[PDB]
Amino acid sequence: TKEEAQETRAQIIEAAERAFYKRGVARTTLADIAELAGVTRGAIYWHFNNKAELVQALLDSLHETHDHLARASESEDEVDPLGCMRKLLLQVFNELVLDARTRRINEILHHKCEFTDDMCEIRQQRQSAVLDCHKGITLALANAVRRGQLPGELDAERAAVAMFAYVDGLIRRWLLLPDSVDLLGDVEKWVDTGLDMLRLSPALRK
Amino acid sequence: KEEAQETRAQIIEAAERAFYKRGVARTTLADIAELAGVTRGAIYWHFNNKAELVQALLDSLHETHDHLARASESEDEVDPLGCMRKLLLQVFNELVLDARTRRINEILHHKCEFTDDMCEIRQQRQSAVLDCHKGITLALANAVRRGQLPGELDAERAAVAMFAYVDGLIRRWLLLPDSVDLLGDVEKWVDTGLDMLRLSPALRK
Numbered sequence A: 001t002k003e004e005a006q007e008t009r010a011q012i013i014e015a016a017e018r019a020f021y022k023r024g025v026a027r028t029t030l031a032d033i034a035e036l037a038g039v040t041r042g043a044i045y046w047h048f049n050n051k052a053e054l055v056q057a058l059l060d061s062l063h064e065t066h067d068h069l070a071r072a073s074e075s076e077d078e079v080d081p082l083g084c085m086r087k088l089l090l091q092v093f094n095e096l097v098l099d100a101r102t103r104r105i106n107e108i109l110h111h112k113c114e115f116t117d118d119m120c121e122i123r124q125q126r127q128s129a130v131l132d133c134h135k136g137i138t139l140a141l142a143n144a145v146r147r148g149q150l151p152g153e154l155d156a157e158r159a160a161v162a163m164f165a166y167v168d169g170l171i172r173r174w175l176l177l178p179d180s181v182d183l184l185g186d187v188e189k190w191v192d193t194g195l196d197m198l199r200l201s202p203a204l205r206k
Numbered sequence B: 001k002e003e004a005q006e007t008r009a010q011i012i013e014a015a016e017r018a019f020y021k022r023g024v025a026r027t028t029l030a031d032i033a034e035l036a037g038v039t040r041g042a043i044y045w046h047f048n049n050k051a052e053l054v055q056a057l058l059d060s061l062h063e064t065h066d067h068l069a070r071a072s073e074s075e076d077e078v079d080p081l082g083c084m085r086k087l088l089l090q091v092f093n094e095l096v097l098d099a100r101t102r103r104i105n106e107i108l109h110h111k112c113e114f115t116d117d118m119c120e121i122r123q124q125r126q127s128a129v130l131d132c133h134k135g136i137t138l139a140l141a142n143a144v145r146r147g148q149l150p151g152e153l154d155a156e157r158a159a160v161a162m163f164a165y166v167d168g169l170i171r172r173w174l175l176l177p178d179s180v181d182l183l184g185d186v187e188k189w190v191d192t193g194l195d196m197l198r199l200s201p202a203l204r205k
Ligand SMILES: O=c1c(O)c(-c2ccc(O)c(O)c2)oc2cc(O)cc(O)c12
Pocket: A062, A070, A085, A088, A092, A106, A133, A136, A137, A163, A164, A167, A168, A171
């Protein structure tokens, strides 16, 4: 039963990471993920309708580790939301450098996953996630404005974009040129540089 | 002319269409040649492989901006920061206004995988970004050797932070266009980033 279904789902997802990583999403089909996993073909199709659905499963496995700190950062009851957002970003960067799984998935998302008309769902998916992530940072930022943590007149919306843009470019930079930027030693300076932009930038106000 | 000089240009325009439609990984020279109306032999004449075409698209982005870029990185110039702000203004303008620039960037960012089959693509991108970094740092060095940026700021970590902000903003606009108002609020976006290189203590040491 159940136990055995939910072990081969883990086996499928794990061969998917390895296969998308070696060969990229474009030219890896479910047929090939099946063989690496050792499962059958019908195993995969019961589990995952198609490739876009599997890509979304990997992208979802990234949320688990950061869950708690993000919903706390976002609740208007919490009294130190910018410190919750700070500590999230520290955990996001640490996990990236320490957890090879997390780094591998991010490198698939960033450097091995094309947007083509062939599978529009991958693009669509991604637009949702960045919108989701946008919705959260905004609420959290608004919370920091009320709590007088960041300038009281701040554009929460444009600040959320600046910040997402900075964190995303930084992750991508290090995925590309790791031995350049020591993300694990200065990790505090990287998170803080971005956060400074939100409290000091006049361009982000009004 | 002779035979065509601008067969090269016609192959490049077909490469952008092929790559934009179906992405770099599953585009062959045969697709590109069929699309260009020439033979594969005519392609190998200008290019040894696909990675070279990808390189040519990349290199074509530096043409419009190279003047404000060269002006920013020299000592002679009076206004180094104002040249980075102008360059970045032109970068964001060309992107929103030119479809070709927008398509080349959407190819680079969202339509080109880094794989073992073609490791020259990841390599060419590393060098391109390292090249860009040497530049940003030189531009940031003379600005601090002036009234423009705080004294003894780590030129290099601010170079990374800025390249990262801009690169992430561009990619974000390509993903969700009608969410950044990239054109019109242009001034604010460029400045949000440049405010970062002064105002931020974390960028100091
Ligand atoms: O939660 C966040 C998050 O996940 C990311 C992010 C960006 C790219 C990735 O590849 C990734 O794994 C994470 O940026 C953020 C930036 C913020 O200011 C606040 C956040 O809460 C997140």
